[PDB]
XYZ file of C-alpha atoms in Angstrom:
465
model
C -0.021 -0.166 -0.086
C 1.091 3.550 1.162
C 0.864 5.628 4.328
C -2.209 7.605 3.209
C -3.233 5.640 -0.002
C -4.189 2.531 2.066
C -6.030 4.713 4.342
C -8.304 6.176 1.478
C -8.845 2.541 0.413
C -10.022 1.797 3.881
C -12.237 4.777 4.088
C -13.686 3.897 0.813
C -14.446 0.340 1.833
C -15.814 1.325 5.087
C -18.069 3.930 3.309
C -19.342 1.166 1.015
C -20.167 -1.183 3.959
C -22.148 1.841 5.799
C -23.878 2.485 2.672
C -24.655 -1.330 2.533
C -26.190 -1.333 6.109
C -28.154 1.906 4.781
C -29.720 0.304 2.203
C -30.225 -2.931 4.025
C -32.036 -1.492 6.993
C -33.616 1.500 5.523
C -36.618 -0.587 4.426
C -37.936 -0.718 8.202
C -38.223 3.074 8.348
C -40.729 3.239 5.606
C -42.586 0.254 6.587
C -46.156 1.358 7.279
C -45.754 3.615 3.958
C -44.940 0.640 1.903
C -47.714 -1.333 3.742
C -50.452 1.636 2.979
C -49.384 1.754 -0.402
C -50.048 -1.814 -1.281
C -52.405 -2.566 1.360
C -50.147 -5.297 2.816
C -50.828 -7.775 5.411
C -48.347 -7.803 8.313
C -47.930 -11.344 7.590
C -46.585 -10.029 4.012
C -44.236 -7.310 5.609
C -42.783 -10.001 7.858
C -42.200 -11.967 4.576
C -40.595 -9.250 2.644
C -38.330 -8.415 5.539
C -37.053 -11.858 6.504
C -36.761 -14.797 4.339
C -35.414 -12.758 1.232
C -31.917 -12.853 3.298
C -31.659 -16.712 2.810
C -30.187 -15.582 -0.632
C -27.895 -12.938 1.296
C -25.801 -15.535 2.761
C -26.609 -19.353 2.575
C -27.109 -19.253 -1.178
C -24.734 -16.384 -2.355
C -22.008 -15.263 0.158
C -20.705 -18.785 0.178
C -20.372 -18.716 -3.801
C -19.019 -15.263 -3.782
C -16.402 -15.830 -1.172
C -14.878 -18.551 -3.427
C -14.982 -16.228 -6.278
C -12.879 -13.596 -4.357
C -10.110 -16.171 -3.484
C -9.591 -17.486 -6.943
C -10.924 -14.525 -8.819
C -10.597 -10.878 -9.885
C -9.952 -7.324 -8.759
C -11.764 -4.638 -6.776
C -14.202 -5.010 -9.472
C -15.948 -7.632 -7.553
C -17.005 -5.009 -4.927
C -17.717 -2.047 -7.294
C -19.721 -4.371 -9.601
C -21.874 -5.501 -6.402
C -22.249 -2.016 -5.292
C -23.916 -1.194 -8.612
C -26.014 -4.251 -8.504
C -27.624 -3.392 -4.778
C -27.748 0.230 -5.778
C -29.749 -0.382 -8.844
C -31.883 -2.884 -7.008
C -32.196 -0.172 -4.144
C -33.634 2.240 -6.874
C -35.754 -0.319 -8.530
C -37.441 -0.738 -4.927
C -38.275 2.975 -5.316
C -39.953 2.209 -8.458
C -41.697 -1.158 -7.689
C -45.164 -1.531 -9.253
C -46.515 -4.324 -6.704
C -45.505 -6.223 -3.689
C -44.099 -9.000 -5.546
C -41.976 -6.645 -7.783
C -40.723 -5.155 -4.379
C -40.126 -8.760 -3.092
C -37.999 -9.575 -6.155
C -35.968 -6.284 -5.945
C -35.235 -7.046 -2.529
C -33.611 -10.333 -3.209
C -31.489 -8.466 -5.750
C -30.333 -6.221 -2.922
C -29.584 -9.248 -0.943
C -27.823 -10.850 -3.616
C -25.540 -7.832 -4.292
C -24.687 -7.471 -0.703
C -23.655 -10.849 -0.320
C -20.345 -9.901 -2.209
C -19.540 -6.822 -0.134
C -17.354 -8.065 2.885
C -15.571 -11.203 1.740
C -13.836 -9.277 -1.140
C -13.438 -6.390 1.269
C -11.659 -8.444 3.884
C -9.203 -9.938 1.351
C -8.542 -6.074 0.062
C -7.704 -4.760 3.614
C -5.629 -8.058 4.512
C -3.369 -7.413 1.471
C -3.512 -3.769 2.171
C -2.547 -3.916 5.625
C 0.338 -5.272 7.517
C -0.494 -7.783 10.329
C 0.879 -5.069 12.596
C -2.163 -3.269 11.852
C -4.924 -5.321 10.201
C -7.045 -5.692 13.105
C -7.350 -1.938 13.600
C -8.141 -1.618 9.920
C -10.874 -4.468 10.201
C -12.349 -2.965 13.277
C -12.700 0.482 11.622
C -14.441 -1.243 8.585
C -16.777 -3.037 10.941
C -18.172 0.232 12.303
C -20.123 0.464 9.001
C -22.841 -1.715 10.574
C -23.321 0.627 13.611
C -23.052 3.850 11.639
C -25.140 2.188 8.913
C -27.854 1.406 11.023
C -28.097 4.639 12.672
C -27.730 6.650 9.352
C -30.514 4.490 7.875
C -32.752 5.761 10.693
C -31.297 9.283 10.114
C -31.554 9.483 6.571
C -34.551 7.486 6.039
C -36.437 9.582 8.638
C -35.328 12.773 6.831
C -36.238 11.841 3.218
C -39.518 10.291 4.351
C -41.973 13.434 4.493
C -40.154 14.791 1.325
C -43.071 15.333 -1.130
C -42.852 13.880 -4.558
C -43.663 17.246 -5.672
C -40.706 18.657 -3.986
C -38.340 16.380 -5.581
C -39.721 16.894 -9.036
C -39.274 20.746 -8.710
C -35.561 19.932 -7.423
C -34.930 17.553 -10.554
C -36.670 20.030 -12.803
C -34.668 22.994 -11.233
C -31.041 21.061 -11.703
C -31.745 20.293 -15.375
C -33.791 17.112 -15.463
C -36.765 17.855 -16.789
C -36.611 14.590 -18.886
C -37.714 13.082 -15.454
C -40.205 15.786 -14.663
C -41.993 15.219 -17.959
C -44.211 11.907 -17.831
C -44.323 11.653 -14.040
C -46.837 13.081 -11.738
C -44.571 13.924 -9.005
C -47.494 15.161 -6.802
C -48.717 11.528 -6.531
C -45.199 9.934 -5.854
C -45.073 8.404 -2.183
C -42.221 9.683 0.054
C -41.111 5.940 0.748
C -40.141 5.886 -3.151
C -37.869 8.957 -2.706
C -36.098 7.320 0.143
C -35.370 4.167 -1.948
C -34.155 6.287 -5.032
C -32.355 9.200 -3.216
C -30.502 6.363 -1.106
C -29.769 3.774 -3.673
C -28.998 5.948 -6.694
C -25.638 7.666 -5.636
C -23.997 4.357 -4.931
C -23.506 3.907 -8.471
C -21.206 6.844 -8.474
C -19.362 5.623 -5.420
C -18.879 2.255 -7.240
C -17.205 4.125 -10.179
C -15.092 6.099 -7.865
C -13.818 2.961 -6.023
C -13.030 1.217 -9.356
C -11.053 4.111 -10.639
C -9.224 4.983 -7.442
C -8.566 1.691 -5.815
C -5.934 -0.776 -7.167
C -6.227 -4.449 -6.459
C -3.391 -4.982 -4.043
C -1.113 -8.178 -4.771
C -2.500 -11.433 -3.083
C -0.549 -11.907 0.096
C 1.467 -8.831 -0.536
C 1.664 -7.084 3.185
C 5.389 -5.792 2.631
C 5.846 -4.388 6.144
C 7.169 -7.817 7.004
C -13.767 -26.771 12.228
C -13.565 -28.765 15.608
C -16.264 -26.472 16.868
C -18.934 -28.794 15.183
C -18.315 -31.723 17.451
C -19.217 -29.403 20.552
C -22.568 -29.160 21.963
C -21.658 -25.458 23.527
C -21.268 -24.145 19.842
C -24.722 -25.210 18.614
C -26.357 -23.955 21.992
C -24.446 -20.677 21.697
C -25.618 -20.687 18.098
C -29.239 -21.192 18.704
C -29.651 -18.877 21.685
C -28.004 -16.339 19.396
C -30.312 -16.867 16.573
C -33.202 -16.451 18.906
C -31.639 -13.159 20.306
C -31.475 -12.027 16.776
C -35.007 -13.585 15.901
C -36.524 -11.089 18.539
C -34.367 -8.358 17.180
C -35.314 -8.850 13.550
C -38.722 -9.238 14.293
C -38.966 -6.130 16.489
C -37.041 -3.902 14.243
C -39.054 -5.001 11.436
C -42.236 -3.595 13.055
C -40.601 -1.153 15.438
C -41.776 1.904 13.478
C -45.271 0.607 12.497
C -45.977 -0.044 16.145
C -44.885 3.636 17.103
C -47.111 4.958 14.392
C -50.138 2.893 15.038
C -49.865 2.867 18.775
C -48.434 6.325 19.441
C -49.116 8.389 16.539
C -45.419 9.334 15.721
C -44.552 10.443 12.160
C -42.496 8.204 10.053
C -39.534 10.797 10.424
C -40.040 10.902 14.131
C -40.278 7.154 14.491
C -36.970 7.124 12.683
C -35.156 10.158 14.082
C -36.181 10.407 17.622
C -36.373 6.698 18.428
C -35.051 4.544 15.383
C -31.572 6.045 15.391
C -31.152 6.440 19.132
C -32.237 2.613 19.697
C -29.922 1.577 16.943
C -26.855 3.423 18.684
C -28.186 1.515 21.822
C -28.441 -1.904 20.409
C -24.916 -1.517 19.035
C -23.735 -0.309 22.632
C -25.196 -3.265 24.269
C -23.584 -5.347 21.742
C -20.135 -3.980 22.333
C -20.872 -4.193 26.081
C -21.712 -7.615 26.165
C -18.430 -8.924 24.347
C -16.466 -6.568 26.581
C -17.753 -7.737 29.777
C -17.090 -11.211 28.656
C -13.449 -10.253 28.058
C -13.126 -7.967 31.145
C -14.722 -10.262 33.725
C -13.123 -13.603 33.148
C -10.918 -14.059 36.457
C -10.141 -17.484 35.293
C -13.814 -17.954 35.352
C -15.314 -18.061 31.784
C -18.898 -17.646 30.378
C -19.283 -14.961 32.958
C -22.804 -14.113 33.909
C -24.672 -13.883 37.129
C -26.024 -17.128 38.248
C -29.027 -18.644 36.518
C -27.184 -17.431 33.317
C -30.105 -16.503 31.093
C -31.360 -14.168 33.817
C -30.245 -10.913 31.882
C -32.255 -11.818 28.965
C -35.242 -12.624 31.313
C -34.977 -8.910 32.619
C -35.294 -7.810 29.211
C -38.398 -9.341 28.527
C -40.199 -7.368 31.170
C -38.610 -4.169 30.015
C -39.695 -5.013 26.503
C -43.274 -5.908 27.502
C -43.561 -2.651 29.559
C -42.513 -0.583 26.610
C -45.090 -2.230 24.446
C -47.936 -2.034 27.002
C -47.177 1.580 28.282
C -49.336 4.585 27.221
C -46.547 7.070 27.911
C -44.348 7.187 24.868
C -41.677 8.560 27.021
C -41.718 5.460 29.179
C -41.880 3.514 26.105
C -38.537 4.951 24.863
C -36.791 4.463 28.054
C -38.108 0.957 28.818
C -37.068 0.123 25.494
C -33.503 1.477 25.799
C -33.159 -0.772 29.162
C -34.596 -3.677 27.337
C -32.213 -3.200 24.160
C -29.086 -2.892 26.361
C -29.908 -6.266 28.461
C -30.868 -7.754 24.982
C -28.135 -6.910 22.730
C -25.505 -7.717 25.600
C -26.490 -11.167 25.263
C -25.928 -11.153 21.739
C -22.266 -9.812 22.063
C -21.608 -12.076 25.041
C -22.605 -15.202 22.849
C -20.166 -14.037 20.163
C -17.261 -13.690 22.401
C -18.058 -17.047 24.362
C -18.043 -18.924 21.083
C -14.402 -18.037 20.322
C -13.538 -19.331 23.958
C -14.359 -23.170 22.749
C -12.012 -23.362 19.748
C -8.311 -22.999 18.941
C -7.406 -19.491 17.663
C -6.725 -20.772 14.114
C -10.406 -22.069 13.833
C -12.157 -18.898 15.503
C -12.827 -17.351 11.984
C -14.658 -20.389 10.792
C -16.307 -20.891 13.976
C -17.849 -17.396 14.008
C -18.866 -17.655 10.295
C -20.918 -20.620 10.926
C -22.370 -19.033 13.924
C -23.325 -15.921 12.182
C -24.719 -17.813 8.981
C -26.959 -19.703 11.544
C -28.052 -16.451 13.376
C -28.784 -14.781 10.082
C -30.892 -17.695 8.596
C -32.933 -18.357 11.632
C -33.064 -14.865 13.232
C -33.546 -12.575 10.227
C -35.098 -15.305 8.127
C -37.881 -16.447 10.710
C -38.021 -13.297 13.226
C -40.016 -10.817 11.126
C -42.124 -13.424 9.442
C -43.247 -14.719 12.999
C -44.098 -11.167 14.148
C -45.842 -10.447 11.004
C -47.953 -13.477 11.008
C -48.748 -13.217 14.431
C -49.617 -9.704 14.157
C -52.109 -10.359 11.286
C -53.431 -13.394 13.251
C -53.909 -11.438 16.500
C -55.771 -8.817 14.605
C -57.791 -11.786 12.964
C -58.889 -12.806 16.496
C -60.162 -9.513 17.509
C -62.221 -9.354 14.096
C -63.455 -12.599 15.151
C -64.555 -11.677 18.774
C -66.176 -8.449 17.404
C -67.804 -9.654 14.063
C -65.792 -7.384 11.963
C -65.432 -9.538 9.271
C -67.730 -7.890 6.612
C -66.086 -4.432 7.398
C -62.677 -5.910 7.287
C -62.997 -7.087 3.814
C -62.856 -3.560 2.568
C -60.137 -2.608 5.030
C -57.058 -0.533 3.777
C -54.585 0.318 6.272
C -53.712 3.705 4.980
C -57.206 5.024 5.608
C -56.403 4.764 9.341
C -54.162 7.820 8.991
C -57.034 10.183 8.978
C -59.850 8.534 6.659
C -61.568 6.102 9.143
C -64.980 7.152 8.276
C -64.352 6.217 4.757
C -63.673 2.738 6.013
C -67.214 2.178 7.234
C -69.121 1.989 10.343
C -66.756 -0.094 12.063
C -63.604 1.791 10.953
C -62.235 2.926 14.200
C -62.777 -0.563 15.480
C -60.756 -1.955 12.670
C -57.939 0.540 13.240
C -57.672 -0.376 16.764
C -57.568 -3.978 15.777
C -54.687 -2.909 13.616
C -52.711 -1.524 16.469
C -53.629 -4.354 19.027
C -52.669 -7.210 16.650
C -49.078 -5.852 16.422
C -48.839 -4.705 19.938
C -49.684 -8.408 20.980
C -47.364 -9.864 18.379
C -44.570 -7.688 19.600
C -45.198 -9.084 23.348
C -45.273 -12.668 21.761
C -42.107 -12.063 19.990
C -39.902 -10.987 22.886
C -41.079 -14.070 24.841
C -38.865 -15.838 22.548
C -36.135 -14.520 24.603
C -37.070 -17.345 27.091
C -36.278 -19.985 24.389
C -32.862 -17.883 23.917
C -32.036 -17.823 27.758
C -32.775 -21.593 27.689
C -30.080 -22.157 25.149
C -27.575 -19.767 26.817
C -28.122 -22.036 30.192
C -27.656 -25.193 28.215
C -24.457 -23.917 26.713
C -23.245 -22.999 30.180
C -23.787 -26.637 31.274
C -21.462 -28.135 28.552
C -19.150 -25.252 28.389
C -16.386 -26.490 30.879
C -16.273 -29.762 28.942
C -16.053 -27.954 25.354
C -13.672 -25.057 26.603
C -10.543 -24.721 24.910
C -7.384 -24.346 27.098
C -3.822 -24.083 25.928
C -2.290 -26.324 28.470
């Protein structure tokens, strides 16, 4: 590399990764908007925000990783950056739920090929003396990306299509002003397009300015599978992630339906704070695992899963509370406890395997936590929400009214729904509220696995003696 040049390459890659997480998570900011537009079932929203990232890892990251090792240059990143940028603007342009769902899978496929190349890139650029600093910096893209998604998404939502159309026209793009009724363009479309578009320019800049480092350069010169502790730590993390993904996927719809916050406020005043908090708890739980190991590992107050068990009431309080102020603060407490156990299980998994094998140990564990947590979490939370609403409709005989239900009318056009419109809106709020509570009860399943891990830990532990 070179004293400031490789630092530029590192910044470029970290920015890509931040943008990767911006595109990935901004979908949760504009949830209810997309739902209103297509009159989607919460079951459908869970489907859109869950299983499509079965293609992110299991069916694409493993292929692309192999491609990077025996493949081509920086091109692979800049190619993927364009793919998931294009697919993100196509989401803005989606005609229907299935088109939206297809484009989303495209984003997933594109993002699969971000980090595996970027790790190799950094590794060859950086000397072992400082590879870990570089990679830690790069990793910050997740935290920054999560918080930026809630900030940029929040800001861009509530931009009127008319506003954007005037802007485009004023900067010389009347080729887009003509043919589009900007007054009827939904804000969530501008979010997707404004967010995804500039990534193509970014990809081009990366490709022009970042040189493919020589493989292995660095000029400044699977035993876990046999262990029950590993599979326990994996499942408990997949259930901690399950709840996290479920909740994030419906976080803003909840806050809107139940407390009447605007899309922007949902994302700016709650979304981005809680994202930071969730990262904070994640780092904290790994830190505490490292700090408090006085020749005593798997550290945790006796009855290991009890910290998760504390998060469950804090969560349930937040959901059931009529004060939004207490909702936020209880949620902050609950996220800290909750995401702590995420980082704790990450650290402990490296305690049961030889150093040479920690990479593949964490890789498998994260594949598991993705497929199960991201793949099922939102889908459970959606289905239960739809189902819990169903039960209200049955109990109150709302079926006839519901047949003409369109979530969007709840905003201010409840009379237009019919005689039982307000009933249906409260059912729409309560179905989700009840599912949010059901969701976090899965932290019982998670705590159960954490306990099971502590039972087999000291047999499966790794010691250098």
